[PDB]
Every structure is written in C-alpha cells, then in structure tokens.
Amino acid sequence: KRQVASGRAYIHASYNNTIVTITDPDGNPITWSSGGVIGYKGSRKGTPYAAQLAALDAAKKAMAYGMQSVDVIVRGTGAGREQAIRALQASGLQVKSIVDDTPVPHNGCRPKKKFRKAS
C-alpha cells in the first residue's frame, strides 16, 4: 500500500535461475521473485518458462502497489533473460526503457576454474 506507479525492474539472469526484483525510483525493492519462488526446484529455475512466470509473478505482486511504469535493467548473461523481458512487457506494466547493465571487471579477480579454461 505504498503507492509508487513509477518503478524499476532488475532482471538478474543466470544459467541457473532468474530473479526479478521490483523497486521504487530510488532503487529500494517493492517486491521480488525468481524461479524458486514459483515452486520450481533444480534445473528448471533457469528454464525461460520459469523466467516468464518469475517476471509475471513479480509484476502482479507490484501491480498491487499501483505500479504502471517500469524502467527495465537486464543484468545477466543467461537463458530466460529476454523471456523475462517478454513477460514484463506483456503484463500491461508500461516498460519505459530497457538497459543492459551486466557488470564486467576491467580484468580484475581471478575467476573460478570452471569459468576460464584458457584464462
């Protein structure tokens, strides 16, 4: 019952899950959701279908704080990334602008072995 109307959607994409946080224009979360929140368990949380629900769930949850307009900020490499956007669009919520903000070091920390092979 905060009332916000205008807000932000952070899609956190990953080869392993998808997590959608909705926030106010300052960045503080109104509500969130993910593959695990829609009752999926293992590999299926990375599945883009999951990502569709995960976004839709997170939407509706926020559409009851009277949201209408969202700035989208995609932030991950994974599957179910664009589908999380697709879901966000088709939820009536006006998507005012999508931005990729995947964080990337200017070569900094020694990565996990799994993620380097040939460096």
């Binding site: 989208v72 995609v74 999508i98 931005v99 990729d100 903000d101 990337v104 200017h106």
Partner: protein, 73 residues
C-alpha cells in the same frame, strides 16, 4: 561488407593529443565508453595508438566515461 560510417571522416582539423577536447574525443567511443576499434575510427596504426593514450588521460580527468550502459535489449 563490414563498413558503415567512418569517424576520421565526420571530423577534420583535430589534435589527437588534446585530452580536453571532449566534444571531439567522445565521437571515438561506442555507446558504452569503449574505445572504438580501428575499423570504425578509421585512424591509422599510429593515430589510434596516440588517441587511445589521449582518451585514457581524459577518462582520469573525468571528462570521458570508462564504461556505460547499453540501452535496447
């Protein structure tokens, strides 16, 4: 194939050592802060080497970005 608008062309009489000429320097970065390749700057082997050192300096002064945010997806 692999050729659109070249950047050395859109401009004219500039100093590649001028690390304050933001209005000119910034034409050489992508939408992200990333310094454009030669195949898009249109600089020669050398000009590019000097411009990259120039852009780098201009980033430390806080005139040019280091990295920005893609706006479509």
């Amino acid at each position: 194939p692999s050729r659109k608008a070249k950047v050395k062309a859109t401009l004219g009489e500039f100093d590649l050592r001028d690390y304050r000429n933001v209005e000119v320097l910034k034409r050489f970065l992508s939408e992200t802060g990333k310094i454009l390749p030669r195949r898009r700057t249109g600089l020669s082997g050398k000009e590019q080497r000097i411009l990259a050192k120039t852009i780098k300096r201009a980033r430390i002064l806080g005139l040019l970005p280091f990295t920005e945010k893609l706006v479509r997806k």
